Amino acid sequence: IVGGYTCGANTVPYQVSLNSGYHFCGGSLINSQWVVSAAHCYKSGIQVRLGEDNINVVEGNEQFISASKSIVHPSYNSNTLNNDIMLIKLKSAASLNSRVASISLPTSCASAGTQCLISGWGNTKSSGTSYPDVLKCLKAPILSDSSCKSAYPGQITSNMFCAGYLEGGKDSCQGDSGGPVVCSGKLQGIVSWGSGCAQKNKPGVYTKVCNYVSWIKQTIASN
């Protein structure tokens, strides 16, 4: 997250870190045994780390649980990034508490201008790299479809939206992929892609979770 703030320990209790001997992507806990992340974050060897603040220190409140299922959307397109969503089933259920909590799925899509909370352990610099120990947060609005498409012509599918800013300085960045965009208490987005981070006229692009609620429910029910 570039241009954000330190969230504070466990203030985003649905935020998970996906770990393979290092943090590589975020995710969002949606029930005690399932996490939403991005399709492009799929790999072998995923350990889900719940309850984290400082990802480099065992502070208390962590739960480390292996993925037992990693389910990339069957129609994920790795060149266009359409359908950039993955479900992870945890090998055992997480112990839910005030520091480890699920986030609700949308009942409808969000409107432009709604303020959302974007969070993660990604790079905090728009030029160069700095990876934070503790979770970072950014308040950011949903952009209109027409402005999103103006910024990224021919690339924004019906399963994407833009959020953030156009003046530069505030965005998600590398290492934030897969993590949450939460707007009035609903998981509306998954950090996906952009042209750089925090660049003028190049807002972040996010998977539109409201299009996948039925797919998520059907997939969880069958697994």
Binding site: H40, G175, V191, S192, G194, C197
Partner: peptide, 13 residues
């Protein structure tokens, strides 16, 4: 340029 926000990024020309 156009890149995913993973470690490492996946980028497109």
């Amino acid at each position: 340029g156009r890149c995913t926000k993973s470690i490492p990024p996946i980028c497109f020309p």
